């Protein structure tokens, strides 16, 4: 079957994306933000991403067996907004506007329960037969947590937790409270490493062997003037934090900056001042989730754990789940957040139609790619001089080994918030100055934010304490003693790291580069950070890459077979 999965809607939505499954294989998958260049894909149908998906696979909407949306939108409208006003045809016109998606007739339209979509994005793509399912996000239509059993190609829900008790919303609110912003929870995770925890309950949570209770909020609380509990939980958490924490909310400041010639947004206080709150929030999240995970594993009799929902992006937490006595194996897809419910919805429907879903297979490279002619057009367009090295991978390795920072835009764009060797900025893993250089000089981002490494899978048994694939940088682990001091820009003082392991099959070019690098500096390991300007999405097109390259003080750009230098 050919099934197009979608997320994103014009009204109060984020993380628009589209994924196309053909006979159980991912033909194409991308996030709207990569095309619009507007981060988070807010308040939009995934128009560009779905257009890309069909173009990639050489299909039109008339070739689809089904279209799937990763929320029960009709139920949300009916229960929260006073009615669902759209026929399937009218809904399709919104999701897939006819001016971009000409169609003779309407494909079958399927709405999939949000947490089922999240669950399908983990289970069906994991390459594992069965396991316990833990979904933790902000909120679906109603619930913020789902515990389920994945087995026999089926997903059976065991229990849920109502939205008012959301761990996702909690974490967003803390992030907003600290001035990092609710839209940047990844930053809160990074800040947390710098703080100390005193009381992980925050005088709000109570923990037990199956999870948590939130005494702060009535679990059945429901906003009568909305379709999720975000505002209600925001009001509760902000009042509580101000009452118990020594610092009041950080505030955003909008002022005209003469040097930039525009009004810029800043924070009133340095968010670093809130590092203890960050640490404490991370600790509460971890403890809550440890209990939920232990509980679903025990109830299902499984030792393989699937995690999805946006809280599953918390690599620090994931690392600590992996080492628990109750967990033998773990799979978290790169698209654990809402961006993955397009894929998840497509999978649930495809499975229902009798297809067998193939494993993701250690790669997230499903977005657009560009031929040498296409890259050349973007280059020629700008009039910059460039080279076509006989051995580009060897040359890039040499640049990295010397301490230079290299833009790397190769093959199909990776999907999800982390660069994985398709759209990356690369630097030395071995350099004790590279971290400060990239934060302060290249990206001009917070000094306290860490970096993480890519390495050959073929060496990771020697480098990391665990011999397993870590394809997505979604899970922390620790290095072995021989590597405790060798890799200062990407390994913390406590030996922890957030790796990508790279197989030759997953990414021949990046694998070959890392191999060359290893010949130069002993270890086929590099620093791998997102290729973007601050606050902007990862670059997608050759023109995107050249633009950001032009803006940042980096040494070179390897784009397709071409090398541009500053
Ligand atoms: N349905 C719905 O609400 O969106 P979704 O499934 O994409 O999950 C979003 C949630 O992920 C949380 N989140 C994102 N990254 C996170 C991180 N690194 N650590 C903790 N929570 C995180 C964040 O706090 C937010 O509440
Ligand atoms: Fe979600």
From Swiss-Prot:
GO terms for molecular function: ATP binding; carboxyl- or carbamoyltransferase activity; hydrolase activity; iron ion binding; ligase activity. Binds 1 Fe(2+) ion per subunit. InterPro entries: ATPase_NBD, Carbam_trans_C, Carbam_trans_C_sf, Carbtransf_dom, NodU/CmcH_Carbamoyltrnsfr. It catalyses: tobramycin + carbamoyl phosphate + ATP + H2O = nebramycin 5' + AMP + phosphate + diphosphate + H(+); kanamycin A + carbamoyl phosphate + ATP + H2O = 6''-O-carbamoylkanamycin A + AMP + phosphate + diphosphate + H(+); carbamoyl phosphate + ATP + H2O = carbamoyl adenylate + phosphate + diphosphate; tobramycin + carbamoyl adenylate = nebramycin 5' + AMP + H(+). Carbamoyl adenylate binds at residues 139, 168, 172, 310, 314. Keywords: Antibiotic biosynthesis, ATP-binding, Hydrolase, Iron, Ligase, Metal-binding, Nucleotide-binding. Carbamoyl phosphate binds at residues 418-419, 498, 528-530. It is an enzyme of class 6 (ligase). Changing residue 530 to A: Binds carbamoyl phosphate, but not nucleotide, so that the mutant is unable to catalyze the adenylation. The active site is at 14 (proton acceptor). ATP binds at residues 39, 418, 449. Tobramycin binds at residues 12, 172, 228. Its EC number is 6.1.2.2. Disruption phenotype: Cells lacking this gene accumulate kanamycin. Its cofactor is Fe(2+). Fe cation binds at residues 114, 118, 137, 338. It seems that TobZ plays a solely passive role in the adenylation reaction: all functional groups appear to be provided by the substrates themselves, representing an extreme form of substrate-assisted catalysis. The role of the iron in catalysis remains unclear. This is nebramycin 5' synthase. It comes from Streptoalloteichus tenebrarius (strain ATCC 17920 / DSM 40477 / JCM 4838 / CBS 697.72 / NBRC 16177 / NCIMB 11028 / NRRL B-12390 / A12253. 1 / ISP 5477) (Streptomyces tenebrarius).
């Amino acid at each position: 079957m050919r099934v197009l999965g979608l997320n994103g809607w014009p009204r109060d939505f984020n993380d628009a994306s589209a994924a196309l499954l053909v006979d159980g294989r991912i033909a194409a998958f991308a996030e709207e933000e990569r095309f619009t260049r507007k981060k988070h894909g807010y308040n939009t149908a995934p128009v560009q991403a779905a257009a890309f998906c069909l173009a990639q696979a050489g299909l039109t909407v008339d070739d689809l067996d089904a279209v799937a949306f990763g929320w029960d939108l009709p139920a949300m409208y009916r229960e929260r907004l006073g009615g669902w006003p759209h026929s399937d045809s009218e809904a399709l016109d919104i999701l897939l506007p006819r001016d971009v998606f000409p169609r003779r007739t309407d494909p079958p339209l399927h709405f999939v329960q949000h947490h089922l979509a999240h669950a399908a994005s983990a289970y069906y793509f994991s390459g594992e037969d069965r396991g316990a399912v833990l979904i933790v996000d902000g909120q679906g239509e109603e619930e913020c947590v789902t515990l389920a059993h994945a087995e026999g190609g089926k997903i059976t829900v065991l229990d849920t937790v109502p939205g008012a008790w959301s761990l996702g919303f909690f974490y967003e609110h803390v992030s907003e409270y600290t001035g990092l912003g609710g839209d940047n929870p990844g930053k809160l995770m990074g800040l947390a490493a710098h703080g100390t925890t005193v009381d992980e309950t925050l005088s709000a949570f109570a923990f037990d062997s199956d999870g948590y209770r939130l005494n702060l909020i009535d679990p059945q609380a429901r906003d009568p003037e909305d379709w999720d509990e975000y505002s209600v939980t925001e009001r509760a958490w902000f009042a509580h934090l101000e009452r118990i924490y020594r610092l009041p909310p950080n505030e955003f400041v909008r002022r005209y900056d003469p040097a930039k010639g525009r009004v810029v947004r800043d924070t009133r206080r340095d968010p670093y001042e809130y590092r203890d709150l960050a640490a404490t929030a991370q600790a509460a999240l971890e403890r809550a989730v440890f209990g939920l995970a232990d509980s679903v594993l025990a109830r299902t009799g499984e030792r393989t754990l699937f995690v999805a929902g946006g809280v599953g992006l918390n690599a620090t937490m994931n690392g600590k789940l992996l080492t628990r006595s109750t967990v033998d194996k773990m799979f978290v897809p790169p698209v654990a957040s809402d961006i993955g419910v397009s894929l998840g919805a497509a999978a649930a429907v495809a499975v229902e139609l009798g297809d067998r879903i193939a494993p993701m297979g250690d790669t997230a490279a499903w977005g657009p790619e560009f031929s040498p002619d296409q890259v050349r057009a973007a280059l020629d367009r700008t009039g910059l001089a460039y080279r076509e090295p006989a051995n580009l991978e060897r040359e890039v390795a040499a640049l990295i080994a010397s301490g230079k920072v290299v833009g790397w835009a190769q093959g199909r764009g990776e999907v999800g918030p982390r660069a994985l060797g398709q759209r990356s900025l690369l630097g030395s893993a071995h350099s004790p100055t590279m971290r400060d250089h990239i934060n302060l000089r290249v990206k001009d981002r917070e000094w306290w934010r860490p970096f993480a490494p890519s390495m050959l899978r073929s060496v990771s048994d020697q480098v990391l304490e665990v011999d397993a694939d870590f394809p997505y940088m979604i899970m922390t682990t620790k290095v072995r003693a021989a590597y405790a001091e060798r890799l200062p820009s990407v390994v913390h003082e406590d030996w922890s790291t957030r790796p990508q392991t790279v197989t030759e099959a997953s990414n021949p070019r990046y694998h070959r580069m890392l191999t060359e690098l290893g010949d130069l500096v002993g270890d086929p390991v590099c620093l791998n950070t997102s290729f973007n300007d601050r606050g902007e999405p990862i670059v997608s097109s050759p023109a995107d890459a050249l633009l950001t390259f032009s803006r940042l003080p980096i040494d070179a750009l390897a784009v397709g077979p071409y090398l541009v230098t500053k």
